[PDB]
Amino acid sequence: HRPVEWVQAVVSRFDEQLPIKTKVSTEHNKECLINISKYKFSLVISGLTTILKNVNNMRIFGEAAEKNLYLSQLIILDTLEKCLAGQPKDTMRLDETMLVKQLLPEICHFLHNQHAAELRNSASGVLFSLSCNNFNAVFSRI
Amino acid sequence: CKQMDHFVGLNFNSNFNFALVGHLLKGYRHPSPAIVARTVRILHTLLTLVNKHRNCDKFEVNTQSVAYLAALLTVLLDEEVLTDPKIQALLLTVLATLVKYTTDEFDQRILYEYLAEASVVFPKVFPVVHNLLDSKINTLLSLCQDPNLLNPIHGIVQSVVYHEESPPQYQTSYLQSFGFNGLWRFAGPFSKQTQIPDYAELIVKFLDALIDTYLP
Numbered sequence: 001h002r003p004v005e006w007v008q009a010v011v012s013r014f015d016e017q018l019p020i021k022t023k024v025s026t027e028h029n030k031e032c033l034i035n036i037s038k039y040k041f042s043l044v045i046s047g048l049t050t051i052l053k054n055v056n057n058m059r060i061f062g063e064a065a066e067k068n069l070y071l072s073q074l075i076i077l078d079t080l081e082k083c084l085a086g087q088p089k090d091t092m093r094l095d096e097t098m099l100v101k102q103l104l105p106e107i108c109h110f111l112h113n114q115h116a117a118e119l120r121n122s123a124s125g126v127l128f129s130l131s132c133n134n135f136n137a138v139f140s141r142i
Numbered sequence: 143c144k145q146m147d148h149f150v151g152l153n154f155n156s157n158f159n160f161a162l163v164g165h166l167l168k169g170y171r172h173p174s175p176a177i178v179a180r181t182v183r184i185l186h187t188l189l190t191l192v193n194k195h196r197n198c199d200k201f202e203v204n205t206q207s208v209a210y211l212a213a214l215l216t217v218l219l220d221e222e223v224l225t226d227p228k229i230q231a232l233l234l235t236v237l238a239t240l241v242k243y244t245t246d247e248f249d250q251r252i253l254y255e256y257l258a259e260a261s262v263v264f265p266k267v268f269p270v271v272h273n274l275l276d277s278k279i280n281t282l283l284s285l286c287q288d289p290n291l292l293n294p295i296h297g298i299v300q301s302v303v304y305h306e307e308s309p310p311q312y313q314t315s316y317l318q319s320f321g322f323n324g325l326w327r328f329a330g331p332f333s334k335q336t337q338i339p340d341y342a343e344l345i346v347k348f349l350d351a352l353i354d355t356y357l358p
Contacts, residue, residue: 003276004306006299009284016284024289032296039304 011047020068037083052076070115077122084129095137149341151324160232163209167329212236231267238271239329254294261301269310
């Protein structure tokens with residue numbers, strides 16, 4: 001259990017492989033995150049969403065913003081794509097737990113300059129993959 | 143001779159053949175490579191004799207000859223030849239001890255392949271040694287950059303996280319149960335304290351036993 005906590009070290013390795021914070025190791029790390037997310041799902045998505053919230057709140061002044069944020073948002077979002085399409089298919093209810101922590105970053109994404117447009121497609125695909133299960137939470141909010 | 147097996151933690155009565163291998167495991171940690179060559183010569187000569195007990199079983203896997211092959215795989219794992227819970231745990235401890243102290247990358251990879259094979263093959267006894275390589279795997283996942291090295295590590299992690307959901311029927315303390323605790327203690331590096339330990343006092347009585355039975 002507590003030796004199996006290596007998944008958090010995998011999350012931290014994914015942080016060190018972020019462009020804002022060897023590429024074969026990044027590919028193997030991403031593939032392992034997707035492979036773990038089939039069986040153990042909540043820890044992987046919780047870690048990745050803490051990552052995306054952190055990437056949202058850092059480093060605005062540099063050009064490192066407009067290039068590394070631009071790449072890293074696609075990296076986090078397509079890992080979320082392959083995680084949600086890795087067939088969890090169980091509710092594990094989490095209606096106000098983590099999905100509420102999902103949707104405010106999501107409307108932070110597609111609430112509203114040149115770099116935004118293809119991020120909107122990836123966020124829309126993320127919502128498309130996400131709303132295959134638990135329609136009731138977003139229905140109650142809407 | 144009961145009392146020394148309590149302190150060194152290797153019981154000859156529990157398993158002779160694995161305990162002699164566990165005694166010879168510190169020969170790989172010798173500073174002299176000639177001693178290592180003598181150690182593997184001992185392992186080969188013991189292998190020839192334990193296969194000479196059987197009929198023409200030299201370099202084929204059977205239970206009375208598994209452990210030497212473990213000690214020889216640095217320089218398979220059939221479930222039906224042995225069918226025993228203790229022997230899988232003992233061989234897995236032997237492999238993990240051969241992992242933790244060696245720093246050779248080729249030996250690390252050739253042991254991680256057999257280890258990830260054993261993770262899929264034997265999930266029921268795999269949480270026994272799990273804390274022993276917990277010290278290695280945490281650094282390996284964070285720092286190492288060789289995909290050939292990490293792929294058996296990755297397979298080990300996927301095998302552990304898939305089969306974690308069962309309660310541990312064989313945990314880490316199971317080694318303490320049948321009197322073979324501290325195999326990692328004996329196979330470690332030399333202490334360089336150059337101090338004789340306490341239990342050697344008991345060994346003194348061991349020697350003064352033997353004389354009283356053997357000259358007259």
